[model samples]
Target: GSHMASMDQLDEIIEQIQKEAINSNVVLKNPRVPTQKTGELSEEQKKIVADYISEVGLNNLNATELSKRLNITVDKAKTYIKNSNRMGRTNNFKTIKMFEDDVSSASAQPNLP
Candidate 1:
């Protein structure tokens, strides 16, 4: 047998490897853009949002997608959407979290009631 006594050392080496993990897909701000909750966007802001919504079709919009377009974070994007009287078609948090890579900003949001 091949020196089974060293198996303990192998286990420790594997643990070390796991800890040393060579990270992949580290984001590094691949796409960046630049919140309010149950809050309202301003007059011009509303114009901007309405256009984007209808143009893209609210059904097709996701918090993550909107965030990129408006240069805001997903949390704020959701807030704008909530107040848009545009729901019943949104409830898009699920879509955002589903497509986005664990957007801590999305879950980190304290907006949930």
Candidate 2:
């Protein structure tokens, strides 16, 4: 004998199955989505992209939005995103150190009443 499951239980089962599918490397075989390759960017452009990513959350940003804001081409913006992902992830500690040093210097100043 079998018992019927509630809607919530069924939804949970479906979610588990989707997770299994992904973990097992099963492709959903959805329709193809077009994507463009990123173009090359200058050092200054790369720095701008990294600064913007540092200001905004990385997961909250995309090349399309950056292109509109920075007045650059989509491909160029994509290049900036790639560079930021590569360099920013590694250099974040350096930025933290830079600010830490600044704070230390400011605190080291003699007390003035």
Candidate 3:
């Protein structure tokens, strides 16, 4: 007889496959560029981000530190980094983790109660 796993294992596998499908779709699909893209990041800002990324490695870069240096919140800093990665250049897991971390940090911030 074949070694069939339990129903719970099968269910978890299905859910994992489903999540992968969605994530894969996002990575495969091309981003929408509006025809009237007047409100997007300026060329100079883009160049600055690109140059910074090139100078400093992207992997394990202290995003929160960069955000603080730039006078922007960690969330906005993430968005800046995301926008910089165009032309199918992106790491989905890193993006998702950053967003999740940002949310967690925001929720856990101590209030002056």
Best by lDDT: 2
lDDT of 2 at 72: 85
TM-score of each: 0.31, 0.32, 0.31
- The model with the greater lDDT, 2 or 3, is 2
How far is 50's C-alpha from truth in model 2 (Å)? 5.9
lDDT of 1 by residue, 18-72 (tens): 4434454463454544224433455656666777766876656677766765678
Better of 1 and 3 by lDDT: 1
The Cα RMSD of model 3 versus the native structure comes to: 21.6
Backbone clash count for every predicted candidate, in the order shown: 2, 0, 0
Q: What is the per-residue lDDT of model 2 for residues 1-85, given as tens digits with 9 covering 90 to 100?
A: 9978676565444335343545434655555673444555556665666667677856567778678756788997777566656
Output the number of the TM-score-best candidate. 2
Candidate 2, residue 59: lDDT: 53
lDDT of 2 at 95: 61
User: Whole-model lDDT for model 1 versus the true structure?
Assistant: 0.63
- Weakest 10 consecutive residues, lDDT, candidate 2? 10-19
